[PDB]
Amino acid sequence: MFERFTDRARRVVVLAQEEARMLNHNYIGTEHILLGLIHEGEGVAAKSLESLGISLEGVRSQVEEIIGQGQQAPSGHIPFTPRAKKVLELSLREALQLGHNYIGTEHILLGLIREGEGVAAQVLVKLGAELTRVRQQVIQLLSGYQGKLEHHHHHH
C-alpha cells in the first residue's frame, strides 16, 4: 500500500528507520514513526499538531526521554514492530473512512493515535492530541491548503 503514500508520508517512514538506527534500536516502533514525522516536519500532520497548540520540539523530547537508547548498531533493514504495523494498518483505515484514496502524513498521525497503546499515542494524547480533535483539525487544514502542501504519489 506504500504506492498510495504521499511524498512526505513516504519520507516519514524512510526517516523513521533512520531515527531508530540513530538510537541503536533494531526495531521501528510507534515512537520512531513519530520521530520521523517530526523530522519531516512540514506536511499536514505536522501543521495540524502545531495548530492545536502542541510543540513539535516538546513531543520529540518527551518521546526521547521515554525510549532512551540501545547498545548495538542495527545493520540493514530495520523491521516495523507489531504495534507499528498496526499504525500503518490504521492509517489506511482512517484514510478510507475519510473518503480518501491516498495516505498522507495526516493519516499516519491519526493511525498513531488510533493505535492507542504505543509510546507515540501515549505522548500525543497527554499533550492534548486526542483523536477526534486531531481529525477535525486535519480536515480544516486539508481545506485551507487546497492540495498545495503535500503532493500525492506521481500526481498531477
Binding site: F2, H77, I78, P79, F80, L88, E89
Partner: peptide, 7 residues
Amino acid sequence: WXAFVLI
C-alpha cells in the same frame, strides 16, 4: 508492505 522500508 507491511514489514520493512519499503515492503
